């Protein structure tokens, strides 16, 4: 029985693959960053609904997905009120700044609102709560390499102001572009394409 099954499988899969290849042997990504066939008919505005190659993609987890509201709040809010914890994490030249400057407080509140919005978007986008998702860069491994290279030593108070991290992330999101163009439609498509990654 096993030998007969192997023979019929090899006989059918051949024709199947032949048809699958003759159906799409002409599709290709054009320089306009769009997939088209031999008739220049757009099949995908962006390859793989993202415009990224399938080689430099690894599995990762969405930390802000399937959390408990209270857990998410206490984990992604950055309390700028516990002066003891602020001194424990950041340095004295930053605790006083984060306490006095209210612009920083407003910026962090706006960041948390944006984080909540992205969490709601993921929940309405990925039903059933599936954190495992394919993305290009493995940020956890990158952070680990950065730690092992720069000798962070997770114990001493670090020197990194939250405003610095916020502005760095914003500048990085502005840099990563797929749909080049200041047009409203161009910007909308760029945001929709790099949504999950950002």
């Amino acid at each position: 029985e096993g030998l007969i099954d192997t023979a019929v499988k090899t006989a059918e899969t051949g024709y199947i693959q032949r048809r699958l290849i003759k159906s799409m042997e002409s599709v290709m990504v054009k320089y306009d960053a769009t997939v088209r066939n031999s008739i220049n008919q757009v099949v995908q505005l962006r390859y793989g609904e993202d415009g990224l190659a399938g080689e430099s993609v690894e599995f990762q987890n969405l930390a802000t997905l399937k959390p408990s509201n209270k857990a998410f709040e206490k984990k992604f809010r950055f309390d700028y009120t516990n002066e003891r914890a602020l001194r424990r994490t950041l340095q004295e030249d930053l605790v006083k700044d984060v306490l006095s400057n209210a612009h920083i407080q407003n910026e962090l509140e706006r960041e948390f609102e944006r984080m909540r919005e992205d969490r709601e978007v993921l929940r309405v986008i990925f039903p059933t709560g599936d954190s495992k998702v394919v993305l290009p860069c493995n940020l956890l491994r990158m952070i680990w390499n950065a730690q092992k290279i720069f000798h962070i030593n997770p114990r001493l108070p670090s020197d990194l102001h939250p405003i610095k991290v916020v502005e760095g992330v914003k500048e990085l999101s502005k840099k990563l572009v797929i749909v080049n163009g200041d047009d409203p439609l161009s910007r909308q498509a760029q945001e929709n394409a790099t949504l999950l990654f950002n």
Binding site: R141, W144, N145, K148, I149
Partner: protein
């Protein structure tokens, strides 16, 4: 090569180990933890190579 960092689980790794103690020190020599391109813990198998 290089300073590679990765963690992997060995085939004969009891699941009821990360919860209990000996999480970062497996008695059975599982939980491959490579840092700066240097094997520290765990045994290599298909799950790692």
């Amino acid at each position: 090569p290089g300073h590679i960092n990765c963690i992997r689980t060995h085939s004969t790794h009891p699941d009821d180990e990360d919860s209990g103690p000996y999480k970062h020190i497996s008695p059975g020599d599982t939980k491959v933890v490579v840092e700066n391109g240097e094997l520290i813990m765990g045994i290599l198998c298909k799950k790692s190579l």
